[PDB]
Design a protein around this nucleic acid. Structure first.
Lengths: 50, 66
RNA sequence: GUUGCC
DNA sequence: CACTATTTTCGGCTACTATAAATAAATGTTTTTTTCGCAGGTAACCCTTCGTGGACATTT
DNA sequence: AAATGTCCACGAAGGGTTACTTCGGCAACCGAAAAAAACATTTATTTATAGTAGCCGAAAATAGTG
């Protein structure tokens, strides 16, 4: 049980859940910043990687 | 893009609350969808001293013009 | 000034 | 072996680049002043109201 | 007369309101907005240099195909 699942189980397995999956769920919740002046300008984020 | 109303059997001569305001982006997004898509190569954007300065290439003169 | 410990 | 086929390269042609100096006119950019921003933990302890009874007053 | 109607002030009860909780020692470490004002640039026109730098471009040339 401790060979494949060590002693720092809670610290690393949350940060490894952060960098892979949890960042895509944040750019998809703050995408498409817009400017009301000159309304045909848009910056949207397609993905994110570390 | 003037204001639009409709005639209900319940309340006749009622005006639409959504047509009262304008979105100011649906018209812009139609043409922006119908623009050409290209993939930027970070080598293509190269710039030198001959950049962002007025002046262009003059079409050289012919003897018919003389 | 603020925290940690005996 | 040879006329091609695109390239390599010069090549001249042109378009700016500080330089001083005149306006006169217009423009564009930035400090220095003068000036009103909307609802239409525990425990005294003092504080307020509730209540209740005080004597004047006026009728019977 | 006198009895009731009424008005008045002190006190009672609870009302929310305000300063309160060891003794040492070691490590450390940290408003905005219009107006007034000033002043450079762009606006030409010379007229001398060399340098980039772009666009061309034709013609020099080795090369690719039959």
């Amino acid at each position: 049980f401790l060979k494949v699942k060590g002693l720092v189980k809670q610290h690393l397995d949350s940060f490894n859940y952060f960098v892979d999956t949890d960042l895509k769920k944040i750019i998809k919740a703050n995408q498409l910043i817009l400017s009301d002046v000159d309304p045909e300008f848009y910056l949207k984020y397609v993905d994110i990687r570390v | 893009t003037a204001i639009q109303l409709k005639l209900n059997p319940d309340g006749t001569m009622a005006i639409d609350e959504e047509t009262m305001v304008v979105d100011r982006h649906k018209n812009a997004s139609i043409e922006n969808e119908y623009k050409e898509k290209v993939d930027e190569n970070p080598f293509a954007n190269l710039y030198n001293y001959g950049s962002y300065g007025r002046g262009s290439y003059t079409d050289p003169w012919t003897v018919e013009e003389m």
